[PDB]
Amino acid sequence: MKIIIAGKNDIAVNVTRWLQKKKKNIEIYAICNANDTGIDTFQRSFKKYCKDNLIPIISLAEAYKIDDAIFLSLEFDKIVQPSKFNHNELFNIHFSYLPKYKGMYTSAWPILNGEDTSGVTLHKIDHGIDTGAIIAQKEIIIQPFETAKDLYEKYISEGTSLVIDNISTLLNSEYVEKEQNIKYSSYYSKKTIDYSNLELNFSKTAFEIINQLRAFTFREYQLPKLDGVNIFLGDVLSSRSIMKPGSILERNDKEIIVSTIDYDVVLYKDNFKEILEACKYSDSKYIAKLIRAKSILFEKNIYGWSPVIVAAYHGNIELIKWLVSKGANINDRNYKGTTVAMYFKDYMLKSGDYSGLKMLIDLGLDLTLTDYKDYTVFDYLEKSGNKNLLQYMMAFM
Amino acid sequence: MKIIIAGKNDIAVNVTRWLQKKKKNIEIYAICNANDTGIDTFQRSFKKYCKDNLIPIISLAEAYKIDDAIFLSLEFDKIVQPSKFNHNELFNIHFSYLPKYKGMYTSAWPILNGEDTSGVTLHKIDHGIDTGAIIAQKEIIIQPFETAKDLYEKYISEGTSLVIDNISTLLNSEYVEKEQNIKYSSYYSKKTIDYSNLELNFSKTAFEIINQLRAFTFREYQLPKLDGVNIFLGDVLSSRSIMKPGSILERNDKEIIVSTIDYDVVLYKDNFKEILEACKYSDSKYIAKLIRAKSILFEKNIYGWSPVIVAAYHGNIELIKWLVSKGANINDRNYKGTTVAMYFKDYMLKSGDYSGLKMLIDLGLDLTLTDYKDYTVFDYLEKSGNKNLLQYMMAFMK
Ligand SMILES: Cc1cn([C@H]2C[C@H](O)[C@@H](COP(=O)(O)OP(=O)(O)O[C@H]3O[C@H](C)[C@@H](O)[C@H](N)[C@H]3O)O2)c(=O)[nH]c1=O
Ligand SMILES: Cc1cn([C@H]2C[C@H](O)[C@@H](COP(=O)(O)OP(=O)(O)O[C@H]3O[C@H](C)[C@@H](O)[C@H](N)[C@H]3O)O2)c(=O)[nH]c1=O
Ligand SMILES: Cc1cn([C@H]2C[C@H](O)[C@@H](COP(=O)(O)OP(=O)(O)O[C@H]3O[C@H](C)[C@@H](O)[C@H](N)[C@H]3O)O2)c(=O)[nH]c1=O
Ligand SMILES: Nc1nc(=O)c2c([nH]1)NC[C@@H](CNc1ccc(C(=O)N[C@@H](CCC(=O)O)C(=O)O)cc1)N2C=O
Ligand SMILES: Cc1cn([C@H]2C[C@H](O)[C@@H](COP(=O)(O)OP(=O)(O)O)O2)c(=O)[nH]c1=O
Ligand SMILES: [K+]
Ligand code: NA
Ligand code: NA
Ligand code: NA
Ligand code: NA
């Protein structure tokens, strides 16, 4: 009944928070990665979560001496001496389908290499990097429209789940170790991609080039650029410019068209900011005309505001309905964990118009959700003494 | 009526040969690569071949102007601008299973990526590099141990066959085309590997690093190095050393063991030349000791002498038998087409010891083969006046 969670970001926090609610008797210790500066971004800080839940934050030296613990690495950044532990209960979540794509930038390389699938892998920590034996594995399908950001989010959801599904095997040490194949194993270092001098390579096929776009589309770090201008995805055209690859063929307000090894490509200029503004008040027929790629309906600005969030804070229900039919999350959250329902609560208070709630509820809105300060929409309504809207909302429970 | 054959190496030569025997009627024009100096090497010079067979050599500019000729490009080094022709009977043999591995280094990249198979592809020349419609294809097994060179040699062989299997349908407009899929498409430029500063990268899996050695093992151009020391393959150990990958563990004279991302690997130093000299006169026993990577027994130096060839010239019969049991080719040739049976005949002349011939015939030695001058071993003995050894060798041929 002891566990050491060593790692970072949302998966570290999700697994930890699951444990606290569902196995309240377990003692939890944490180790944080070097560059966890204790501040939330588009990723939760695990250091911050741990300080706020009174989870003692230990070091690796101390971890070696805590004999009855299991040691769970959720993207931990430091090599560990597996034999130094007095037990063998040492696990790691790796964001790939091992033995492929060991190492770095696993939301990028599978896409770059034109993979259809990737995965998450729960394995033993061994003397190899990402090389210890497999315990549990999840194949993830990458969709042709999906970016690095989209795939990373799958890694988060699916890795969290993978841990939770297997948590008892781990806790009881009743799991089977199957050793990794050497065959088709791959590894990429941090040197494989220079994200500080990121340049698209057009001396490639059009298939490859779109796959670069997809792969490098991870807004919160960067977007790919063509001539100082951000791009959000692209498509293959039927034309084949004789121009040397890289040559810009046309240039207009919506796009750039380039010569590749084979088929020409359209790079769509990023209009995410325009779209998000429009979402305050535009109908879906107008918004649909603005979209050149589906994935952009689910992007977020620096606060974590998505199209569905903006639309909810402005009571733009007709648009919310459409967005959800395009696959948006009716319970989308910002980087404080603030839910769509919380944004709409604000619209309901500001407008006095409460009737739309049932519409959102029927779209899957969940009022029981808690933000990162652990407050529900009902809590906020009490703090602030808006008893009428509170009673109205309560009636749905 | 007419056919333009554009390219280099054994593929250009063998396809051109084939057309000359099996299609004398057809006029042949030839275009050559910039790096074909007219000197044979590990591949033949198409230019030398064309000069010696009085095949006219033309330029690509001149070929653009030749209507009612088929155009076939075989490891050609120039962009063919297809609309510059006034017809559309434009064909290329590419050394990949298209649309994978378009462009360059098709002997290295697939191995580097850990592929089981590659291919040769016969297609139309269209707009784009290796993009035109597929006519015929052959899948090719890459064996786990084979080098880039071995892979290249299969490309040359299988490419030649695919052209030969389909060349009539090209001449007679009876072929079919399927457009290439976009999906799974790849291209590698000349920049994708810098042979000049070829460096090994141990920041990789063992599998990847052995695949690195394989892909960089093309001796006539280079072998991989390590601290400047040439390397002939390696194996995957079971040790998982904690030293940051690239860290050289043990040096001896046979090998250097290295730290990887996962398992350590033994690189084997290139002693090939040492093996070649020892093959003159030493026995199975001494060579088996010299040998780490078995397939080093099938390497050739820049004239095409392998272990069996050197062994045959010095009548090292027991060494020959052992080498064949390892998988050497009993009729192995150098780069002038000179066969084992030719090297042996020189031993037979010097030693007067003819007795080992029967043993060789029974391993498959073939006395009917010709070199590139088109002489059998018989023709050489008859020219030099050795009627005796001539008739002896004839008595034993099958
Ligand atoms: C989506 C959106 C939000 N806002 C305002 C409303 C919000 O109070 C402020 C900061 O946004 P936030 O940081 O996303 O809000 P936070 O996560 O602090 O949540 C707070 O504000 C929301 C509206 C409340 O339901 C919640 N209970 C508060 O904690 O920006 C706008 O002005 N326009 C918008 O489109
Ligand atoms: C230049 C070079 C090549 N190689 C290997 C890798 C390569 O696949 C093989 C043959 O080399 P090449 O003849 O220079 O041409 P390559 O394989 O790059 O083929 C390309 O160029 C020719 C001219 C095209 O018609 C062909 N379709 C292309 O694939 O030898 C080396 O190992 N070291 C080298 O320095
Ligand atoms: C294999 C070998 C050959 N030699 C000699 C003998 C040979 O004539 C000369 C050049 O080698 P080569 O270029 O491989 O031979 P080439 O293709 O010129 O064929 C000639 O010499 C051989 C031995 C004759 O059977 C043949 N009939 C000749 O055309 O080098 C050696 O000195 N040491 C060797 O280990
Ligand atoms: N023994 C062990 N094996 C593991 O698989 C593992 C641990 N420890 N500890 C936690 C986590 C740590 N994983 C890693 C993985 C890569 C690097 C690393 O330094 N990579 C660099 C340099 C590679 C090199 O030295 O060439 C890179 O650029 O990739 C460090 C820690 N982990 C499992 O997640
Ligand atoms: C660091 C970095 C990552 N990425 C992408 C590819 C990664 O698989 C994904 C997740 O990165 P993350 O796990 O946050 O960082 P790192 O791999 O450096 O520890 O983010 C970028 O697009 N740009 C960047 O600068
Ligand atoms: K501490
Ligand atoms: Na990097
Ligand atoms: Na082009
Ligand atoms: Na190069
Ligand atoms: Na190592």
Asked if A248 and A180 touch (Cβ cutoff 8 Å), the reply is: no
- Bridge partners (DSSP) of residue B11 are none
The per-residue b/e assignment along A7-18, b for 16 or more CB within 10 angstroms, e otherwise, is bbbbbbbbbbbe
Asked if B43 and B9 touch (Cβ cutoff 8 Å), the reply is: yes
Query: Which three-class secondary structure state does DSSP give residue A245?
Result: coil
Tokens of A45: 């800080």
Q: Phi, psi (5° rounding) for residue A328?
A: -80, 165
- Spell out which residues of chain B touch residue A129, defining contact as CB-CB under 8 Å: 261-262
Nearest Cβ partner for A261 among B187, B240, B261: B187
**Beta sheet of B117-124, edge-to-edge order:** B27-31, B2-7, B69-74, B90-94, B117-124, B134-141
- Spell out which residues of chain A touch residue B112, defining contact as CB-CB under 8 Å: none
- Scanning chain A, the segments in alpha helix (DSSP H) are 9-22, 46-52, 60-64, 109-112, 148-172, 206-216, 272-278, 284-290, 307-313, 317-325, 340-351, 357-362, 377-383, 387-394
How distant is the alpha carbon of residue A115 from its chain centre? 19
Q: Ligand 5 centroid to A191 CA: how many Å?
A: 12
The ligand that comes nearest to the alpha carbon of residue B258 is 10
- Please report where in the chains the tokens 């020219």 appear, as a residue: B383
Nearest Cβ partner for A262 among B131, B189, B261: B131
Atom of ligand 4 nearest to the CA of A103: 29
Q: Ligand 4 centroid to A7 CA: how many Å?
A: 12
Residue A188 to residue B260: CA distance in whole angstroms: 12
Nearest Cβ partner for B261 among A114, A129, A242: A129
* Half-sphere exposure at residue A260, Cβ-oriented, CA atoms within 13 angstroms: 32
Quick one: closest CA in B to A188, which residue? Answer: B204
Residue B99 to residue B134: CA distance in whole angstroms: 9
**B262, B263, B264, B265: best to mutate for the A interface, most A CBs within 10 A:** B262
Residue A207 to residue B183: CA distance in whole angstroms: 6
Q: How far is CA B208 from CA A99, A103, B202, B234, B261, in A?
A: 12, 13, 9, 12, 10
Residue B120 to residue B162: CA distance in whole angstroms: 8
Q: Phi, psi (5° rounding) for residue A73?
A: -90, 120
Length of chain A: 397
The per-residue b/e assignment along B117-135, b for 16 or more CB within 10 angstroms, e otherwise, is ebbbbbbbbbebbbbbebb
Ranges assigned E (strand) in B8-81 = 27-31, 69-74
The sign one gets for the Cα dihedral B211, B115, B304, B49 is negative
Q: Phi, psi (5° rounding) for residue B6?
A: -130, 110
Residue A236 identity: V
Q: How far is CA B354 from CA A17, A224, B333, B392, in A?
A: 86, 73, 21, 8
Q: How far is CA B296 from CA A66, B7, B125, B200, in A?
A: 52, 30, 38, 20
Q: Which of A17, A7, A4, A125 has its CA nearest to residue A69? A: A4
Residue A45 to residue B391: CA distance in whole angstroms: 89
Question: Any known ligand binding at A322?
Answer: no
Stretch (H or E) spanning B47: helix B46-52
Distance from CA of A37 to the nearest CA of B (A): 27
Query: Which three-class secondary structure state does DSSP give residue A70?
Result: strand
- Spell out which residues of chain A touch residue B114, defining contact as CB-CB under 8 Å: 183-184, 186
Q: How many CB atoms lie within 10 A of CB A97?
A: 20
Length of chain B: 398
Asked if A315 and A356 touch (Cβ cutoff 8 Å), the reply is: yes
Q: How many CB atoms lie within 10 A of CB A217?
A: 28
Asked if B172 and A191 touch (Cβ cutoff 8 Å), the reply is: no
- Spell out which residues of chain A touch residue B102, defining contact as CB-CB under 8 Å: 205, 261-262
- Spell out which residues of chain B touch residue A99, defining contact as CB-CB under 8 Å: 205
Omega prior to B307 cis, within 30 of 0: no
Quote the DSSP letter at residue B396. Answer: H
Q: How far is CA A273 from CA A191, A288, A292, in A?
A: 32, 15, 14
Residues 6+ apart with CB under 8 A from B163: B11, B15, B72, B74, B93, B122
Residue A307 to residue A330: CA distance in whole angstroms: 11
Q: After which residues is chain B broken (C to N over 2.5 A)?
A: none
Omega prior to B99 cis, within 30 of 0: yes
Question: Any known ligand binding at A351?
Answer: no
Q: Which of B260, B349, B337, B259 has its CA nearest to residue B313? A: B349
Tokens of B309: 């060839």
Asked if B311 and B319 touch (Cβ cutoff 8 Å), the reply is: yes
Ranges assigned E (strand) in chain B = 2-7, 27-31, 69-74, 90-94, 102-103, 117-124, 134-141, 187-188, 231-236, 248-251, 255-258, 265-269
Sequence spans of domains, chain A? 1-199, 200-270, 271-397
> Resolution, in Å, please?
2.2
Residues 6+ apart with CB under 8 A from B76: B6, B7, B8, B31, B33, B92
Tokens of A156: 């988060």
Residues 6+ apart with CB under 8 A from B169: B135, B175
Query: Which three-class secondary structure state does DSSP give residue B25?
Result: coil
Q: Long-range contact list for B341-345, CB < 8 A, 24+ apart?
A: B341/B312, B341/B365, B341/B366, B341/B367, B341/B369, B341/B377, B342/B371, B342/B377, B342/B380, B343/B309, B343/B312, B343/B313, B344/B312, B344/B313, B344/B315, B345/B377, B345/B380, B345/B381, B345/B389, B345/B393
Q: Ligand 10 centroid to B264 CA: how many Å?
A: 6
Q: Phi, psi (5° rounding) for residue A72?
A: -110, 115
Residue B381 to residue B174: CA distance in whole angstroms: 48
CA dihedral A144, A147, A148, A149 (to 10 degrees): -140
CA dihedral B121, B125, B131, B135 (to 10 degrees): -40
Residue B331 to residue B333: CA distance in whole angstroms: 6
Residue A380 to residue B11: CA distance in whole angstroms: 78
Q: How far is CA B350 from CA A21, B90, B314, B318, B386, in A?
A: 92, 53, 9, 18, 12
**Distance linking the first and last C-alpha atoms of chain A:** 36
Query: Which three-class secondary structure state does DSSP give residue B349?
Result: helix
Tokens of B67: 């209507």
Distance from CA of B395 to the nearest CA of A (A): 52
- Scanning A118-225, the segments in alpha helix (DSSP H) are 148-172, 206-216
Residue A370 to residue A128: CA distance in whole angstroms: 40
Residue A40: exposure state from Cβ atoms within 10 A (0-12, 13-18, ≥19): middle
Stretch (H or E) spanning B168: helix B148-171
* Half-sphere exposure at residue B197, Cβ-oriented, CA atoms within 13 angstroms: 3
Method: X-ray
Asked if A30 and A5 touch (Cβ cutoff 8 Å), the reply is: yes
The DSSP code sequence of B201-255 is --SS-HHHHHHHHHHH-BTTTB---STT--EEEEEE-S----S-TT-EEEE-SSE
Tokens of B200: 């090994």
Q: Which of B112, B116, B164 has its CA nearest to residue B140? A: B116
Task: Identify residues of A whose CB sits under 8 angstroms from chain B CBs.
Answer: 79, 99, 102-103, 114, 126-129, 131, 182-187, 189, 191, 203-208, 236, 240, 242, 261-263
Nearest Cβ partner for B128 among A114, A183, A262: A262
Asked if B378 and B390 touch (Cβ cutoff 8 Å), the reply is: yes
Residue B160 identity: T
Subunit contact A184:B207, Cβ cutoff 8 A: yes
Distance from CA of A13 to the nearest CA of B (A): 29
Longest alpha-carbon distance in chain B: 69
